[PDB]
Amino acid sequence: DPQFTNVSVHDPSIVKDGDTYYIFGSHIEAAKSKDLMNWEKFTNGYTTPNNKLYGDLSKNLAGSFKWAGENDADSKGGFAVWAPDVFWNKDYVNEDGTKGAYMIYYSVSSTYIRSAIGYAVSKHIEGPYKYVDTIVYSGFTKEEAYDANSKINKKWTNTNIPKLIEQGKLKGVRADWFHNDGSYNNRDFPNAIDPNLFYDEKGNLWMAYGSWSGGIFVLPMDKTTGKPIYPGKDGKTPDGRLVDRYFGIKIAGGYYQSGEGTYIVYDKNTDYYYLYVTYGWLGADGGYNMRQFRSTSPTGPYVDAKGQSAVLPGEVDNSPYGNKIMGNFLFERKVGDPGTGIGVGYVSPGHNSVYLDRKTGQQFLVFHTRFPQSGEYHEVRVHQMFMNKNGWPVVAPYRYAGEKLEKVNKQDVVGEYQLINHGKDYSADIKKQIFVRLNRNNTISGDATGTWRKIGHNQAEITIDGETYDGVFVRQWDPTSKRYVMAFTALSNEGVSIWGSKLADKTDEEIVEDVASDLDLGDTDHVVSNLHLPTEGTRHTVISWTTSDAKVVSETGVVHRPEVGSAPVTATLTATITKGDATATKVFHITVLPYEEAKLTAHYSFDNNDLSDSTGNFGPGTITGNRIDNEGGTIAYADGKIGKAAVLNGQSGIRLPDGLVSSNQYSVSLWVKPEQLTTHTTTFFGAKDPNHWISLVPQGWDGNTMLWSGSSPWYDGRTFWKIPTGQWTHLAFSVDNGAVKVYINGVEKFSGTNFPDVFTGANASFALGVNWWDPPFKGLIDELRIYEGALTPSQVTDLAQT
Ligand SMILES: [Ca+2]
Ligand SMILES: [Ca+2]
C-alpha cells in the first residue's frame, strides 16, 4: 500500500532544501525525495569531467587530491571521495562578496590513516560545488616517508600545518602526533574523515569528524569562511578528555577501536546534544551497528543511558558503550506467517544522519544498510524516531511509511507480539524474534515474563525479565503481512533496545491450518540434495517428520541418490503439525535423481589465440594487469598441451565472465606449466567479492600445491605434493555441497568436507593467475574446463591423459 522507491547511497547525509529532502553520500552519489519514501538519484558517481557535483573532479579538488584520494594507495585506479555533509550557511562570504552558500564538506582517503577533510561551496544545492580549502590532515609523518603504490610525501610539511604555524594559529608540531619511529600516532589522534557540521543552541557552528584510530574529535568553525578555529594549544577538558592544538576536542572512541560516521543533533525541546556514531565494519560480515549518546554541551562529555563516557578508557571492547539503537535483525517469516520471503531484516545498518523538524518536532534516522542473503548490496532506509520519557529518542522498528504518533487504545495493544532485542554485542550474527503476549491484566507472558503499561496517549513502559524499557506504541507498516500493525520500541537505562510487532489474533486451529498451507519442500520431483525439513512453524507450532522409505530419504531429509543408470527412486515424507490441541498433516512425494556425470559449462582452450569460450555459453575473457580488477597487461600464445595455450608473463592475468560458477555443485580442470613458483600465487581464482574466495594454488604456505579458501572461513585443502616448474601438470577439483576432492595428474590427493559455499546467490568474479594480494602466475595455462556437478574420477582420468 505505501510505496517505496529505493536508491543506493552509501553514508547518507540528509538535508532539507525547501520542499525537497536531499541525501549526499560517498562516491559522489546523491538523491532527492519529497516524502522520504521515494528516492530519485541525480548524480553520476565518479564520472569526470562533467561530474554532477564537482565538474572536472580532478582539477576542482586538486588541492585535496594532492594529499590523498586520487589514484594513490587504496585509491589507485580511481577516486576516493567519502561521506560528505551538506548544509546551508547563511553567513558564508562568497568569492564575489555575497552572503550565503551550500557547503559540502567531503573527505578524501588513500590509506586507513592518510586522509583529509576539505570543502567546496555552491549557490544551489544540486551543484556544482567549487573547492575552497583542505582543512584537516591525518596520517602524516615526522620525516620523509611514502606508502606502497604512492609517490606522495607524508611528511607533516606537506600539510597545512606549516601555514598555520606561520600564521601563529599553532605554536608548532606536537611531539605526541608521531610514534618513536616517526610514524603517525593513530592510537590517540584521528583518521581525518566522515565530517559532520552542526549548529549548537546559540547558532555557533561545529565540525565533528573521525573514524576508528584515535577516535572522534570536534572543532569550532568560522561561519564566515568555513575554516576551523584551531584550539592552538593542547589541554584537557574539565572532565579530563584530550584537547589537541590542531585536531580539536575528543568526544568519542579511542585506542584503535571502531566508531565512524559521527552525527550530532541539538534538540531544543530537551536541551540535549545527541551524538550518533556507528561501531564495527561496513561489510556484511562487519556487524555495523548504530550507537547513541548525549551531552548538555556541544563538546561533551557525551554519555549513554548508563551514564558511561563515549570516550573509551583504553584499548578495550567498545560494545558496552553507547545505546545500541540498531544492529543486525530479522523479523523472520516462519512457516504459516502471512506473506512471502524470509521476512524483513537488515545486515550492517549504519553511518547515519538525522533530520529533526524544527516545526513538527518529528525526527528521522537516515542510513544505509545491507540485507540478509543479499551480499554487499545496500539501500537507503529511513526510520522515524520518538522522544521517550527519559529524554532519549527511540527508533521505530519498521521503515517510515507516513505514520505519526496517535492516541492508542489498550484494546489495540493487547495480544501477541514478535519481539526483537538488539542487546549490546555485535557481529555477523542476526537477531531473530521471540514471542510474547501483552495481556489485558498488564502482564507479559510467553517467551519472557513481566509487565507493560501504556502511559498517556502512547508512551510505553515494558518490563521484561527484570528490565524496564521506555518508549512508545506506534502503528507501522509491516511489509511482510502487508498491513499496518501495532508496534512498539523502547530503551532501558542499560542502553538496550527492544522492538515489538503485533501479530494477528488467531486460534490454534487457524495457525496449524496456516502452517499446513504454507509448508513446502520446493520441487520434490528432482531431488539431488538433502531436504531441509522445518521442525518449527510460526508461534512455536511444532512440525515432526516421518518417511515411507528411509532407504530413499531419511526422516531428516537425508537423501540417497541411486547408482548412475538406475531409475529415479521415490518415497513419501509426512509432516505432523501441532500447536496446542490443534493438529494437521501434509504429505510430500519425493523423487530422488541418480548420480550423473558433471556437465561442461565452459571451455577456454585458447586454441584460436583468443580468450573465447568453446561451448559458447559464456562470453570471452579479458586481459588484466597485476591484479584481478585493473587492466594493462598482455596475453601471448605458445604451443600447449592441447594446441595453443595462454602465456602469462608475470605481470598479467585473465578475467573471466561474472558468475562462471554460480552454485554449490561444480568442478574445474586445467593444465599448467609454471616458469616460477611464488607462495599464494593463484591459477584458478573465484570470489563473490574480495572477502569470499576460492584459489587453486601451485605453491601454498606449506610449500605444496593446494586448494585454498577465504576470507571467512578459511579452508586448507592440501595435497602435500610439490609442482615442478618447466613441466605440464594437470589440476582438477570438485565441490559437492560441502565435500571437496582435489586431483593431481588424475590422482586424488585431497578429500575433505565442510568446504565453503562461495558462489551460490552471488555471481562471482573469476580469474586466471591474478587475485588481490599476490604476484601473478608466470608460465603457461591451457584447457580451462568448467563443470556443473562433481567430476567423476572416470572423467578426471580422461582429461589427465588425452
Ligand atoms: Ca556522515
Ligand atoms: Ca589449448
Side-chain angles (χ1 to χ4, degrees), residues 1-357 360-403 405-550 552-562 564-598 600-608 610-630 632-687 689-802:
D1 201 45
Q3 242 207 349
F4 304 88
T5 312
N6 301 313
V7 289
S8 292
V9 184
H10 214 263
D11 312 315
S13 211
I14 196 156
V15 50
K16 197 172 193 170
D17 188 45
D19 299 316
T20 310
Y21 297 107
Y22 294 79
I23 50 181
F24 296 78
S26 297
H27 320 310
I28 322 187
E29 309 282 339
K32 59 183 171 184
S33 171
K34 313 278 285 201
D35 60 17
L36 299 172
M37 283 170 278
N38 296 270
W39 294 96
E40 152 183 89
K41 187 172 294 187
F42 62 85
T43 44
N44 61 351
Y46 284 124
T47 290
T48 191
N50 188 34
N51 177 267
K52 186 76 179 67
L53 296 190
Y54 297 112
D56 185 346
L57 188 52
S58 171
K59 300 300 150 33
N60 190 4
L61 305 194
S64 287
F65 284 140
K66 282 185 185 198
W67 171 256
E70 172 166 45
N71 199 37
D72 172 272
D74 291 328
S75 63
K76 184 179 172 60
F79 291 99
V81 183
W82 288 357
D85 201 344
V86 177
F87 77 110
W88 171 259
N89 187 350
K90 67 179 164 57
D91 307 288
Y92 185 78
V93 176
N94 295 291
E95 46 190 17
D96 65 12
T98 55
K99 309 290 224 65
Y102 293 97
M103 323 187 67
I104 188 164
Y105 287 74
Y106 54 87
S107 208
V108 289
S109 196
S110 287
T111 73
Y112 73 104
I113 49 166
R114 186 159 45 88
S115 325
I117 289 164
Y119 62 113
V121 292
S122 170
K123 336 166 194 90
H124 293 283
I125 199 182
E126 310 208 352
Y129 287 84
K130 184 178 186 264
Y131 182 69
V132 180
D133 209 346
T134 297
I135 51 175
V136 182
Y137 295 71
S138 60
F140 48 82
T141 52
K142 186 109 204 171
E143 296 284 358
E144 182 172 352
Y146 297 83
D147 291 325
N149 287 271
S150 180
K151 284 308 196 318
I152 303 196
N153 179 18
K154 315 186 305 177
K155 187 173 189 176
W156 67 273
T157 51
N158 301 105
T159 66
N160 60 337
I161 301 194
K163 164 153 173 136
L164 292 176
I165 296 162
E166 141 171 23
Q167 298 187 237
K169 279 153 181 178
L170 314 160
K171 301 300 183 181
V173 171
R174 184 178 197 158
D176 298 287
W177 292 345
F178 321 100
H179 291 141
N180 294 333
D181 67 320
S183 74
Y184 183 71
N185 173 10
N186 68 311
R187 175 185 176 89
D188 304 294
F189 297 98
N191 188 24
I193 67 181
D194 294 9
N196 166 233
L197 281 285
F198 69 97
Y199 285 107
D200 63 20
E201 189 195 335
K202 301 299 183 181
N204 306 316
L205 179 70
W206 300 88
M207 178 181 72
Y209 66 95
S211 172
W212 296 61
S213 296
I216 309 304
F217 285 72
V218 67
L219 285 162
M221 300 292 272
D222 195 306
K223 313 205 285 169
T224 283
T225 67
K227 306 208 189 311
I229 305 166
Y230 306 92
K233 147 168 59 67
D234 312 345
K236 285 143 68 78
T237 69
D239 66 292
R241 287 140 45 226
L242 172 63
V243 184
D244 177 86
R245 66 194 63 183
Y246 180 63
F247 292 106
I249 306 168
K250 185 179 295 198
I251 56 177
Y255 296 103
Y256 302 112
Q257 307 312 294
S258 66
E260 54 183 20
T262 302
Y263 204 85
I264 285 166
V265 161
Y266 173 73
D267 191 324
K268 69 195 187 314
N269 307 286
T270 64
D271 199 27
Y272 278 112
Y273 296 81
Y274 293 98
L275 168 55
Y276 300 86
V277 61
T278 302
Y279 287 177
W281 154 254
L282 64 91
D285 298 296
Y288 226 39
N289 93 30
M290 288 174 281
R291 297 287 171 151
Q292 166 198 65
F293 301 85
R294 77 182 171 188
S295 185
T296 48
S297 147
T299 63
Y302 288 87
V303 304
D304 61 18
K306 270 198 112 185
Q308 315 171 120
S309 179
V311 178
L312 309 170
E315 184 178 355
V316 305
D317 172 31
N318 62 6
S319 309
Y321 304 95
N323 312 336
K324 178 185 175 198
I325 67 176
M326 196 187 301
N328 293 348
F329 76 90
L330 171 60
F331 287 102
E332 165 168 13
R333 206 196 57 85
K334 300 187 188 291
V335 185
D337 271 343
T340 60
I342 61 164
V344 48
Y346 296 164
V347 171
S348 280
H351 196 127
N352 74 281
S353 47
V354 179
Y355 173 78
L356 178 61
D357 194 321
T360 173
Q362 272 190 135
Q363 192 165 208
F364 303 95
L365 186 72
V366 179
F367 55 100
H368 76 248
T369 185
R370 284 136 174 91
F371 305 89
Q373 309 180 348
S374 325
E376 297 297 302
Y377 171 77
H378 57 87
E379 277 171 13
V380 173
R381 288 294 184 282
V382 179
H383 287 223
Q384 200 176 351
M385 318 178 76
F386 309 102
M387 191 64 66
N388 85 351
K389 60 164 279 193
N390 293 324
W392 289 113
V394 298
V395 183
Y398 296 97
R399 84 199 287 189
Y400 173 64
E403 79 286 341
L405 283 181
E406 297 281 355
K407 169 80 172 63
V408 174
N409 306 315
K410 169 186 262 217
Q411 196 193 38
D412 309 312
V413 168
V414 179
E416 317 217 328
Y417 283 79
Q418 336 159 55
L419 190 132
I420 280 180
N421 184 316
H422 288 273
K424 288 305 209 66
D425 69 318
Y426 58 97
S427 69
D429 281 11
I430 305 180
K431 306 301 223 300
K432 298 172 164 39
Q433 73 266 41
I434 64 186
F435 297 90
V436 304
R437 279 195 45 92
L438 310 206
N439 298 312
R440 179 155 282 289
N441 66 351
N442 291 91
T443 58
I444 295 178
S445 44
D447 290 8
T449 59
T451 61
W452 69 278
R453 286 168 59 217
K454 178 178 71 90
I455 307 178
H457 279 200
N458 49 60
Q459 284 186 6
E461 189 196 24
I462 281 80
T463 304
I464 293 180
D465 301 337
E467 312 288 352
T468 295
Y469 302 77
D470 296 289
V472 296
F473 290 105
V474 63
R475 184 166 304 276
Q476 293 229 267
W477 168 258
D478 163 32
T480 302
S481 68
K482 298 185 171 215
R483 300 293 205 278
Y484 290 94
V485 300
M486 184 53 59
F488 66 71
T489 165
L491 178 86
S492 65
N493 59 26
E494 292 305 295
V496 174
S497 181
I498 62 180
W499 286 354
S501 195
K502 199 188 172 310
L503 301 172
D505 296 359
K506 282 183 175 296
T507 65
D508 296 348
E509 258 131 13
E510 292 174 313
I511 296 300
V512 164
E513 179 186 358
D514 292 336
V515 170
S517 300
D518 194 38
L519 186 53
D520 185 48
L521 297 187
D523 166 48
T524 33
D525 291 318
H526 305 78
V527 182
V528 304
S529 300
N530 294 319
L531 297 138
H532 171 77
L533 316 182
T535 68
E536 186 169 69
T538 189
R539 320 193 194 197
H540 289 308
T541 296
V542 176
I543 316 189
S544 62
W545 299 84
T546 82
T547 166
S548 68
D549 191 353
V552 190
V553 46
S554 71
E555 275 177 340
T556 59
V558 166
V559 290
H560 314 134
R561 315 180 43 169
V564 200
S566 320
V569 189
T570 64
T572 291
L573 284 168
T574 295
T576 292
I577 299 166
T578 59
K579 168 73 174 323
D581 291 311
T583 311
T585 283
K586 191 162 180 170
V587 295
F588 301 85
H589 305 296
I590 278 68
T591 302
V592 175
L593 304 185
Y595 304 110
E596 199 168 32
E597 275 201 340
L600 189 76
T601 71
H603 173 203
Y604 295 88
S605 70
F606 315 103
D607 286 346
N608 303 322
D610 58 31
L611 301 184
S612 52
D613 170 18
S614 288
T615 66
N617 292 318
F618 293 74
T622 65
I623 301 91
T624 87
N626 209 341
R627 272 132 211 203
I628 182 176
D629 54 276
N630 62 65
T634 38
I635 303 302
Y637 300 94
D639 308 344
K641 201 60 174 95
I642 299 195
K644 224 56 170 190
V647 189
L648 288 163
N649 42 358
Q651 300 84 28
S652 310
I654 297 173
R655 246 210 88 186
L656 303 158
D658 294 298
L660 189 57
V661 172
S662 42
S663 99
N664 196 28
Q665 312 188 26
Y666 66 91
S667 316
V668 173
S669 160
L670 79 177
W671 292 89
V672 299
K673 199 224 281 292
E675 198 78 333
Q676 64 174 24
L677 299 188
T678 48
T679 305
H680 298 130
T681 289
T682 191
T683 60
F684 186 81
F685 181 92
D689 29 31
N691 40 340
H692 315 120
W693 49 258
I694 181 183
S695 174
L696 183 55
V697 196
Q699 177 183 281
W701 51 261
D702 75 333
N704 287 321
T705 301
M706 79 171 64
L707 187 71
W708 202 40
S709 199
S711 33
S712 34
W714 297 75
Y715 199 122
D716 324 298
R718 338 180 285 152
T719 82
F720 301 94
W721 192 83
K722 234 199 163 313
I723 191 183
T725 64
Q727 271 167 10
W728 285 104
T729 290
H730 177 262
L731 303 169
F733 67 89
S734 52
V735 172
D736 57 46
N737 295 129
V740 61
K741 269 68 180 180
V742 174
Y743 304 86
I744 313 287
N745 299 327
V747 184
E748 199 218 322
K749 294 288 175 89
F750 180 84
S751 300
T753 78
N754 194 34
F755 182 84
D757 191 334
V758 183
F759 306 110
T760 320
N763 82 313
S765 294
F766 294 88
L768 281 179
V770 289
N771 53 18
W772 274 290
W773 310 278
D774 291 288
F777 187 73
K778 222 177 102 57
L780 297 183
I781 310 293
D782 199 37
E783 306 297 291
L784 174 64
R785 306 181 72 86
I786 313 283
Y787 297 78
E788 254 157 43
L791 282 172
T792 76
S794 181
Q795 301 179 272
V796 173
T797 303
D798 292 351
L799 312 170
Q801 293 181 359
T802 76

